[PDB]
């Protein structure tokens, strides 16, 4: 009988939960009813953007369990996910394989 | 003669650090900002408040000064005295993207 | 007894890679990631409610809180896909 | 770069108005003893990408509160949001 918000929107992230978090936050004094169905639709897209790219770092390393290093090879190997996570370090991260041309031969 | 050319840079660097102008002329620069605003949601030529273009040229030129003041330290590093584009670009590579793109 | 988003991430994983698992320390990033796109976005859609001195964070004030934060061509798809899931919030 | 101009000859550009002896006098304030000759094609490119991260943020604030006039408090906000707090106008 026309059930819960997240299925009503075709999302996967909890639209009920965010509307609670917008109210407990004191972000504004009133929170509109179209707001968390836009905010949880965005977060679901970004989480479906890392894991589409962090699936490959498990795939090209011939593994099936995404470790932290398989995120680090997907955050730093994308032009926009770099600049969004400009500050952010990742524990158990490693670094990229930087090969300086003058150190090589 | 062609041996007495006044030493005309060290008077300049001592001159400009004593003063506080805006170093770029307005109508050149103000036609630059009004072009870049067209590239975002075209058509609507946004009117600009006249105190805003003083507020975006006190913040461009106080960044480019502190890029040349900061990229020049690599030219003194490499033994040179002259700047080069291999020197300004290494200021932006170290500043570690949020300052320059 | 704290809650987190470790269920909701997992269903997104099974929808784009239908076979891959995800280890338990690499869920703790995808929680503390989505607690950080959130608290940047609705930490700043608070502020356009204050600079226009309104009082309701509408769906419209998440739209420019996205267009400031997510850079590049990343935001052109995110704003395309929020409004896709707002048209079919109403027309249901 | 939104343009549909096609005549294969024109004026300077519009950026070719930030003159040579200005980009000298920026750098002479910086302490630069002696400039290269290729910096003039450089700083026109660094200045262009500085404005696409202030004007792109200040035209979002103005397109939000439904206006057409990019006021002084917008460019102060698009620089305070960017990280470069300006103290002239706020």
């Amino acid at each position: 009988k026309a059930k819960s918000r997240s299925s009503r929107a075709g999302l996967q992230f909890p639209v009920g939960r965010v509307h609670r978090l917008l109210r407990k936050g004191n972000y504004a004094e009133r929170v509109g009813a179209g707001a968390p169905v836009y905010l949880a639709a965005v977060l679901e897209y970004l989480t479906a953007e890392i894991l589409e790219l962090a699936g490959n770092a498990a795939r090209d390393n011939k593994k099936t369990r995404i470790i932290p290093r398989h995120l680090q090879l997907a955050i730093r190997n994308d032009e926009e996910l770099n600049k969004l996570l400009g500050r952010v370090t990742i524990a158990q991260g490693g670094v990229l394989p930087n090969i300086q041309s003058v150190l090589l031969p | 003669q062609h041996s007495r050319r006044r030493q005309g840079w060290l008077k300049e660097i001592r001159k400009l650090q004593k003063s506080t102008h805006l170093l770029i002329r307005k109508l050149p620069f103000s036609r630059l900002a009004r072009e870049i605003c067209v590239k975002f949601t075209r058509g609507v030529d946004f009117n600009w408040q006249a105190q805003a273009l003083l507020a975006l040229q006190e913040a461009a030129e106080a960044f480019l000064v502190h890029l040349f003041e900061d990229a020049y330290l690599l030219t003194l590093h490499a033994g040179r005295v002259t700047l080069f584009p291999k020197d300004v670009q290494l200021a932006r590579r170290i500043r570690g993207l949020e300052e320059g793109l | 007894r704290k809650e987190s988003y470790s269920v909701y991430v997992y269903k997104v994983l099974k929808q784009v890679h239908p076979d891959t698992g995800i280890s338990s320390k690499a869920m703790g990033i995808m929680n503390s990631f989505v607690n950080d796109i959130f608290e940047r976005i609705a930490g700043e859609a608070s502020r356009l409610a204050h600079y226009n001195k309104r009082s309701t964070i509408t769906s419209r004030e998440i739209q420019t809180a996205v267009r400031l934060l997510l850079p590049g061509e990343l935001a052109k798809h995110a704003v395309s896909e929020g409004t896709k899931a707002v048209t079919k919030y109403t027309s249901s | 770069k939104g343009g549909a101009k096609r005549h294969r000859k024109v004026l300077r550009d519009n950026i070719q108005g930030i003159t040579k002896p200005a980009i000298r006098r920026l750098a002479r304030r910086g302490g630069v003893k002696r400039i290269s000759g290729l910096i003039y094609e450089e700083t026109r490119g660094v200045l262009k990408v500085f404005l696409e991260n202030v004007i792109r943020d200040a035209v979002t604030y103005t397109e939000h509160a439904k206006r057409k006039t990019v006021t002084a408090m917008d460019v102060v906000y698009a620089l305070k949001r960017q990280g470069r707090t300006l103290y002239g106008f706020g």
Partner: peptide, 20 residues
């Protein structure tokens, strides 16, 4: 489904040349 945004690589940001 789950479409894509052109994810390239790092792109070596920090050099400026007029687009040609």
């Amino acid at each position: 489904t789950k479409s894509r945004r052109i994810s390239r690589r790092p792109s070596d940001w920090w050099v400026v040349k007029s687009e040609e």
